[model samples]
Target chain A: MEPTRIATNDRLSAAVCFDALVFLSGQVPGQAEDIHGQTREVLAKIDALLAEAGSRKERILSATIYLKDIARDFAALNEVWTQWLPTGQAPSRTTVQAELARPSVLVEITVVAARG
Target chain B: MEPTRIATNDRLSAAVCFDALVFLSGQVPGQAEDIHGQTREVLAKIDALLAEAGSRKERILSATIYLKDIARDFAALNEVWTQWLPTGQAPSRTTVQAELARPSVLVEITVVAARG
Candidate 1:
């Protein structure tokens, strides 16, 4: 069966659900300048989108994190991430420094999650 | 049951299998100078890793592509990608420009595929 796209446009969908998993589009920060605030905002967006897609953060199977400045922001990003995650539910994660699409965006995250 | 990680190390797993899917680490190009060669090299690595993980490119459900120079390489990257993929089995994909970990690497690809 084909995957179902949610919030799709000509460019891309916010999330795609197929089989028993949900693949989320990269979520970027909103108005936050610091990595701490930006990471929190991005995680919040992920939470809402995952919930809308019938999954949750605790069910995430993998997470890919892109940071604009890894040396400066990795710790702060992890601070927020560790706090947000449910105990013992950490997904397989990979963090890397990457140039974001927006100059102001400090972080972008994408995840593959199992359906609840 | 907990997810099974393959080729794991202190830092990360080369791939993780959970539920019915395999989540692969970002596959980077080897000694390729141009985008075309780099893209092909990265895809080849993905093919090998996917095969080792008991999945294949045709079973891929989603792909995240990172390029060092999107404007210069996107078209060339697409050329190789189009030729490499099976017709009508293209996975959902998102591509963006990003600074890679190594200076010589032009592309990195990570994928989620269904286990065969």
Candidate 2:
């Protein structure tokens, strides 16, 4: 009824999944330029992972956005996010600006969702 | 199987639950002063929300803490949080400083927990 994992290396799994609940590791934009493409890029990865784990973006219950420069990117990023979300399927979301792992990574979003 | 939301609002529900998992909105101190009191107060609110969702702190799977001033408040807040949390039940956590919705609120804690 359960499958478990232990660390074999420093990097964690793309997502830590269990008992129909899905929790993802922070997803950073893959080399895409601009906040728009980067946001789409990151979200696509999230959608793929959610699908793999039997969940979807609509099933997402929470999203935390970490931005390298909140003042500049918050509005444009949310505009993209608003368009991306299914109507009335929004989760509890929090956004903040922080010095990210890589200087060029403008956006990172982590999320939680339940099984499909 | 999802039963749906307990309450609805423009501000946000105290907690969102689906399929035996819970997602809490960022919890803040009510009337308490200082990081210690505020942390305790905020956690109490979290506990109340968790209980309402038919869960508890031990079942907490993740927490993202938003601090108003990390340099001054981080260590103190964690000290209190460490005491509050049950041993070995810590969830994956990320803490960052942000200017919260309220200047009076020094800390805001958001959590995700599995059902009891």
Candidate 3:
């Protein structure tokens, strides 16, 4: 098979099939500064990326979330997340606190969803 | 093909063949309380998940690790990890500290591996 393509758009960079897998670069909070606002922004980006790949949240197999401060923002972020996810269709998720590329951004998310 | 089935046992939740993939939920330290104990416990959980999927550590394609205390325990965890992983077979891994669901629980792991 031909080597899978890596697509780069304004908000995300994705590798079509790396070793039979789709790899997505880390996505930061779009235009938000705080954790709560950033959470919404980042999730939107995730939705867009998945959509671009012809997939949706329900098809996500796994996700990794990075936070600037886990203690201060986790609950706030989850408040939005619980509503966004499909009931009983949540993909495996792991969240962690880390120093992100930008200081003002409080959250970043990366995921792998199914594609045909 | 049919929709992948979600498997739930006492300690873990898993989905098989979700859009041509196997997804696994975050696995926390089996019964450990402190960060040190939890790291070991969670890693073991990852191993079990891979085994159930008919894969092994070497087949893992990607992994994400969550820690309760990144500053305090990262180095210690790495020390144990280097010995466990196969040479040059390590999957892409990302680790960050976060506030896990249980206060005393220190670590959690989730991974994706290739299956034939």
Q: Could you tell me the lDDT of residue A75 within candidate 3?
A: 85
Worst 10 residues of 3 chain B by lDDT: B3-12
For TM-score, candidate 1 versus 2, the one ahead is 2
lDDT of 3 by residue, A20-42 (tens): 34556677787777777788887
Taking the tens digit of each residue's C-alpha lDDT, what string does model 2 give over B1-116? 75244343432356778876788877888898799999999999999988888899899998989898999999999999999998988889999888665458789899988988
In Å, residue B9's CA in model 1 sits off its true spot by: 2.0
Residue B56 error for model 3, in Å? 4.0
Instruction: State model 1's lDDT.
Output: 0.84
> Which clashing pairs does model 1 show?
none
TM-score of each predicted structure versus truth: 0.64, 0.71, 0.72
Residue-wise lDDT of candidate 2 within A28-88, one digit each (tens)? Answer: 8877989998998888888888887778877777777777777788777877788788665
Ranking by lDDT: 1, 2, 3
Each model's iRMS: 4.0, 3.4, 4.7
- The fnat scores of all predictions, in order, read 0.18, 0.15, 0.25
Overall lDDT per candidate, in order of appearance: 0.84, 0.80, 0.69
Cα deviation at B8, candidate 3, in Å, is 7.2
